[PDB]
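User: quick one - fold this with inositol-(1,3,4,5)-tetrakisphosphate bound?
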Amino acid sequence: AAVILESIFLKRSQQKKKTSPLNFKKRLFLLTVHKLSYYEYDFERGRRGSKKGSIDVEKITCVETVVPEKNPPPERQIPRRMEQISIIERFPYPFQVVYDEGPLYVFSPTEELRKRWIHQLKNVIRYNSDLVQKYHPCFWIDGQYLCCSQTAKNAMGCQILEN
Amino acid sequence: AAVILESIFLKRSQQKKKTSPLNFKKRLFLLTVHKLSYYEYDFERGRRGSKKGSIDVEKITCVETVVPEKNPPPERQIPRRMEQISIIERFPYPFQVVYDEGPLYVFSPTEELRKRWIHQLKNVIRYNSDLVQKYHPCFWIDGQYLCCSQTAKNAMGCQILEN
Amino acid sequence: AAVILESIFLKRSQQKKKTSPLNFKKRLFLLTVHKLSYYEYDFERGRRGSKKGSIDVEKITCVETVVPEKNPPPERQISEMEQISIIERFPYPFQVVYDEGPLYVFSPTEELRKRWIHQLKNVIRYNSDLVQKYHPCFWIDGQYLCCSQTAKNAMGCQILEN
Amino acid sequence: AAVILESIFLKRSQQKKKTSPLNFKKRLFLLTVHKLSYYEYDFERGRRGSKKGSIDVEKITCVETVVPEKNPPPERQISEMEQISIIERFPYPFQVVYDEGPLYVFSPTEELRKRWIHQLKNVIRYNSDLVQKYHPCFWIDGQYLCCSQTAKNAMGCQILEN
Ligand SMILES: O=P(O)(O)O[C@H]1[C@H](O)[C@@H](OP(=O)(O)O)[C@H](OP(=O)(O)O)[C@@H](OP(=O)(O)O)[C@H]1O
Ligand SMILES: O=P(O)(O)O[C@H]1[C@H](O)[C@@H](OP(=O)(O)O)[C@H](OP(=O)(O)O)[C@@H](OP(=O)(O)O)[C@H]1O
Ligand SMILES: O=P(O)(O)O[C@H]1[C@H](O)[C@@H](OP(=O)(O)O)[C@H](OP(=O)(O)O)[C@@H](OP(=O)(O)O)[C@H]1O
Ligand SMILES: O=P(O)(O)O[C@H]1[C@H](O)[C@@H](OP(=O)(O)O)[C@H](OP(=O)(O)O)[C@@H](OP(=O)(O)O)[C@H]1O
Ligand SMILES: [Zn+2]
Ligand SMILES: [Zn+2]
Ligand SMILES: [Zn+2]
Ligand SMILES: [Zn+2]
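Assistant: Sure. Structure tokens for the protein plus inositol-(1,3,4,5)-tetrakisphosphate:
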């Protein structure tokens, strides 16, 4: 369909599979009313590459900011003070797109960008059937969730954000 | 003025003073357009007692839920399954009323109640001049904030909740 | 034994002592089978304070409603649920009668009454002295306006059959 | 030395070799005082890849705009800021001329050009051979349509004074 948005972010490994590393990839993310998908980016040629995953827009229970990790390495750190480059190498503002399998973590290089996305994603998911009301505002890491130490990657959020 | 709300909650020590313990008190909380105030409760006689603090409604930068502590003792635990009593002895749903001096933490015995309050408090603070946009969704405890480990009790929130 | 109930009613002075004035105290009531007890409530620590009374279930003769008195002071004026009202307003005055006489416990709400009474019955039900005429009326100012008669333990101007 | 700039322009083949076809590569340009260099960009690791060229600043004779060619293929078609467009669209073709000849670097945006050029000048400014007639025109298909003349390093059909 149409592309609502398209940006380059740094996403963390969903680690769907056991043997998978916890790592980050620069990916070109798209968004249609249908899905949220991400592809390898072919910078040389300038084009989207091989698809590396999607999440169907309707299976989405929730989308929000995530509490930034405490000691992020520079690729996701906030500087002090050339953007065109930085905006494709430094992604410090994460957010979370949660669904049945768990949460996909996505870092954005600017806030506005993150804002932009969360919002559309919101619009997009407004009438979904499973919009959860409790989420985890912290990352899932090393076996469990910081915020509540629960271990089920798709555990119930330990917090209700209600207006 | 009018009372918008009145409930009994279990509040944690603001510890404004150095020599102060980190502890909880059952307090009768009120809310007018002017302030948010809390008093000792005189249960025998059934009346509000001596005032023990307020926070001026306009100095309020923010109000939200807080991520529940991981191992709360029973007075703030969620049961399994007589309410009239429980609702004055068990307060497991906290929330945070933040202002210049820091955050006041307030536990509510039910969610609806917490809902109710956060909302009015919201209305009440809608046109305030300092409504912060970043908060700490976790408690301040033992010297710093869990969510971001910052130590300034009135540190900048490490998270932006934007719709 | 094992509690069977537990609530916070208001209760008028039993006046057992000649000195005793009449007044109401907010108390925390329990229920087992053996007895039915009330304490001072540690609102602050949120817990049961000093025992202030007991009535053995066995000596219970008549668990029953009483008659919402005429002009309940606020306190007692008009299951219901105000976190605070419900521990500050008990307009459903009931009555437990026993050897010594009748205990006047008040309720913030009906389901609450029901709940107790009923339960009361479950527990006295096999007693040895379930009287069958009673004073749905109060005992007051010197005498039961049930039957203007005067012995607290005066016999009941009314009968409740079934 | 100390970078003075750093960007990602597109750049047409210098064709130094007879084999060399003409094409454009996305490259990462730096700037110091000594030289001006371009590399392959490690987009994935987000970093500077293999060096693909250098031009000594000193041998710089003429830093200057060139002439937006006729029918820029998308790629080059129409400071500006699309996270992606700005690293995918460089329509502001400029030119660095030196001994060997002229290097055709393209820009996604004007402030970006300006920024470089200017800076360029700061750095060649005291050179020993700042020529003063140039070919705002391209060198193409066999010959500079600046002056239809043919030596790459052909002398400039135009002068830029000040
Ligand atoms: O490239 P290597 O070093 O194998 O590691 C990968 C990447 O992080 C993947 O991201 P992408 O898919 O973006 O390549 C991730 O997939 P997701 O994070 O998309 O799931 C894979 O996890 P699994 O989820 O275990 O497949 C993980 O194995
Ligand atoms: O009763 P003790 O054992 O002294 O401890 C108190 C109570 O927690 C107070 O609550 P309340 O005011 O509700 O009594 C608290 O005030 P706040 O939490 O209101 O500030 C005091 O902290 P300071 O903030 O340090 O005064 C703390 O000293
Ligand atoms: O506290 P003060 O003002 O002294 O009055 C007391 C309380 O009403 C007692 O209730 P509680 O025990 O619930 O405090 C009542 O006991 P009962 O429990 O027998 O009513 C006392 O009378 P006596 O009944 O006379 O002891 C009465 O004097
Ligand atoms: O990669 P392929 O298709 O082989 O083509 C190359 C690139 O355009 C070179 O650019 P880069 O070095 O930027 O890759 C260019 O070098 P210049 O940098 O001299 O343009 C080469 O020509 P020569 O100029 O003939 O070497 C040209 O053949
Ligand atoms: Zn959690
Ligand atoms: Zn924080
Ligand atoms: Zn009678
Ligand atoms: Zn020319």
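One thing worth noting: The pocket of inositol-(1,3,4,5)-tetrakisphosphate (ligand 2) is lined by residues B 11, 13-17, 20-21, 23, 25, 27, 52-53 (CB under 6 Å).
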